[PDB]
């Protein structure tokens, strides 16, 4: 074929009771630092817009070509014109080829791509802005191999970057090494990483920036994709079990953690199902839960664990109902890095959002919508005091209740 | 459908009569620093691009659907690779829902917006590169609300930033209101502004930014919109009388100026039309006058008035002769605020081009064009007085006569 | 017709025999600096991409209209987000009037164009990622003036800037007035250049930037354009031999360097050729040769010879063994400019790509390409003393023998 244009932008506008700005975001929270989303309904008043560009081309032989461009931009500003604070950034530019007549065997369906991407089998938890897995960078590798036909494998070299890409002292390569192998519903993901001398990065200054740091990892992913609500129900549900250690011990940005010493260990669990209630109802639950230990300090600690739920009820072919019910518990032990101080507590969030599209309204995921909104936060004082520079204590946003309003935009095509 | 790709587009080159770099712009007077414009033609040597992606869908049922985004630059660099002064920004990401099925009565054919974006709406004086009024910013809102079937109403909600949006004590979001009514030719908008303790903004040091600023405002327009050259010849025109007190006194670029006192007043006059002479020539006047007191400073006072006049001669069906007159008086009393000084005059330009195109010669928007040209600029003396580090009396540009040549292209698609 | 997206795009991966970075390039050798391209294959590891929308337009009367934009980015970064280092600018901005009507005689299909170009007539020597000329900037001109049908002519003025664009005291615009005629296989190209007191540029201090730079340049070529292997089997080749004084002593970038002295004086030839073997091998040689005198500082001379080797081995009609051998001699002589010694050697690669494509593997330009590589570079260790913060010579990279594996995608459409 030819060209094509696909893309996601969310786009919208986050006030308080007195028509002044707040705080918002899927990552506000303390445990937002190490991972700890929360519902984003009526939560993010950015401007995030990607833009993919692609060059199709299917030859007559089956062969397929295919080139993509993802420009991204990021934007807390409402204003029409933002050059000085512009986020603008190639995300991903790749070439796949698929469907070669050459390939045979258990490569006969295989794609083979190469460059900066986000790996295709990338799969998030949507209402909570969280990837379940995010493997990107830059290198390649191959898509679908399949053996004895129902044991198909992906195998890559992405690589990355830790420090300063400028500073020629302050800069390191890390590399990872991935099999993602996919047997029925089941998935099981292995990734060793290697960042060559990244404890021996030096700043500015001429110090050790860590020292402490990891030159390695490994990384694993078990998966469950069923096509049911769990099993007991129409509907859909992933479920994932995370687990890393050193470099690895980030377990949704692959290798994108230089900080990590290497006794770094992590453990998180993933999980959320779509399902109707009625031929109006519909709801989606989620978890994201997660403990992780000797992280950027000896002995520290950080646990938490979400619940997000949300529900829509359709009134017309045009309009319906979103609610939005986050919660949210954390026991944090950073051990004086960054300056945090060790808390715990939890953090409610409940919102309503009047929604108009014209897609079903039943699918959770088509996306033209325009959505008017209203939110309620509250959370344990004490979390106030895990940063100085944090959302929960700043001036304006440390009281117990934390109404919002607001309209914003979002789609993908 | 599916994908839409449309912009604008000027670029080119201006040099003085010794071939060496001068002095040029639609707002290079003193008077432009409060909007007040002059001829374009010949008087804009850099480079500027609106790129704008669209992604349209139009459901069976007559419901359309609508995402765009808008990415903008301008240097005044005539190098091929400008990395290092790049002003690359996203201007807009919007979603529109049109004609949907579920909306009865007055919201009929009435389409649903989010997002950041120029409003529909706004309108301009192109041979002076500046808009009538430019509603702009991120919110939501509704277009085309039928009442009686003879009076059209626009509803919204635009929100902007005001300082610093990562100093978070030099930051303040204002919002505005705004219906937008309209009856035949007749246009009448009411806006009302709020920008919660913009006065209390204190800078990077700890000192109040300004301390008299305006915390609210308002904003009106009333336009006459017409089919003819002013009611007596063939052709069109537009008149529109702008007001403005507070935040609102900024009447272009609503709610885009925090300096503003409360007790800012402005009035703005904006008309010009357009007519054919003969089957060769084409004539578009036009003019923008102003009056703004206690604007900055308690008893200042800014009042100007431009007058524009372009003139084409088409010559072939390829070829034309583009002429432009542009007369500006001012008198400005800035009472001491940002170094200026108080300053009184006129400023004439005179342009001559001959223009490329293979559109309608005799439509002054068929704009694949191609011009050369030559303008001659003088101007008061005491001009330039009213600052040191402006354009009029700086090093070559002080002298009665100044002469410029160049070529450029303008479109738009 | 309407839209349309063409680009170019490499993007890659390139580590030593440690799993660790190191340096690559084309431009890596102290010849470099002043032009010295080696070959390219295995050894580029930026994602450098090239978006060019279009908007084209032909009329019923064969007249055609037509816009590009070139938004260009370059990361050596290899992660998915890139904003801090982001390069992304808008390297073009132009518009072509064709064919039109109303132009006859020698002008009859002859194009018109103005704004920011790369010059549609400038050519490359692609396995070394060099222009052989380029011309580039802002201005205006037009293609293919036809005289007695067998001798065509491009003129055009394209300018250029010295200097910071935002400090009027270093800042300097140079203009470029050229004449390109063609002549069957044979071109002959002039070019004058000036850009006024270059030499009275003062930087931020308040000193001379420079002092002795040139304020004019005379640039000239001479070209062979062969539809075979140099006359002696079947392909293609061009021969060119490039001249330049003053500011035309940069021979390739036009304009392009604004610190070369009036007495700079260089020569260079560029020649390539591409021819099969069989139905199996294509070869391309290619040769960049240079001297330079008085260029930057009286006395100075740089001299350098490329000989770059591309070979292609077709295996299946996906896969192809490419090979790369690279011979560069060079012998610098900077007189003090820059802390540069005066270094003289010779350096040597040796690349073996396993690539894998869809296209016709005999076509060195067909290009949606996935390869895999080897390096092997070595040089004498003399050339590590030219600078103390080049590559050679750097941390990691001075030894003899210096090994490199990687894995990247290259197309454009
Ligand atoms: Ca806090
Ligand atoms: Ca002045
Ligand atoms: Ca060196």
Request: aromatic share 14%; hydrophobic share 35%.
């Amino acid at each position: 074929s030819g060209f094509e244009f696909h893309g996601y932008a969310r786009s919208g506008v986050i006030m308080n009771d007195s028509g002044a700005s707040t705080k918002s975001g899927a990552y506000i929270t303390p445990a937002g630092e190490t991972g700890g989303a929360i519902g984003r309904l009526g939560n993010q008043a950015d401007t995030y817009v990607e833009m993919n560009l692609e060059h199709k081309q299917t030859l007559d032989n089956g062969a397929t070509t295919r080139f993509k461009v993802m420009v991204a931009d990021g934007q807390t500003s409402y204003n029409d014109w933002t050059a000085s604070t512009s986020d603008l950034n190639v995300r991903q530019a790749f070439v796949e080829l698929g469907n070669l007549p050459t390939f045979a065997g258990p490569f006969k369906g295989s794609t083979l791509w190469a460059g900066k991407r986000f790996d295709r089998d990338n799969f998030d938890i949507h209402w909570i802005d969280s990837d379940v897995v995010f493997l990107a960078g830059t290198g390649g590798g191959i898509y679908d191999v399949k053996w004895n036909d129902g044991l198909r494998s992906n195998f890559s070299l992405y690589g990355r970057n830790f420090g300063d890409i400028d500073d020629s002292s302050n800069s390191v390569q890390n590399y990872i090494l991935t099999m993602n192998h996919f047997a029925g519903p089941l998935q099981m993901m292995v990734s060793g990483l290697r960042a060559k001398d990244n404890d021996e990065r030096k700043d500015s200054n001429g110090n050790l920036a860590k020292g402490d740091a990891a030159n390695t990892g490994v990384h694993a992913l078990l998966g469950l994709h069923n096509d049911s609500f769990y099993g007991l129900r129409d509907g859909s549900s992933k479920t994932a079990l995370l687990y890393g250690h050193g470099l690895g011990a980030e377990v949704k940005g692959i290798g994108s953690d230089g900080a990590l010493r290497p006794g770094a260990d992590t453990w998180r669990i993933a999980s959320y199902g779509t399902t109707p209630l009625s031929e109006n109802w519909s709801v989606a639950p989620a978890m994201l839960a997660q403990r992780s230990k000797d992280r950027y300090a000896d002995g520290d600690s950080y646990q938490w664990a979400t619940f997000n739920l949300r529900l829509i009820q359709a009134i017309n072919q045009n309009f319906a109902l979103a609610y939005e019910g986050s919660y949210q518990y954390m026991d944090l032990k950073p051990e004086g890095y960054n300056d945090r101080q060790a808390v715990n507590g939890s953090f409610y969030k409940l919102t309503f959002a009047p929604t108009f599209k014209v897609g079903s309204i039943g699918d959770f995921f088509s996306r033209p919508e325009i959505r008017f909104y209203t939110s309620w936060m509250d959370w344990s004082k004490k979390l106030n005091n895990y940063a100085s520079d944090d959302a929960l204590g700043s001036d304006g946003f440390n009281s117990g209740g934390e109404w919002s309003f607001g309209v914003q935009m979002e789609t993908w095509f």
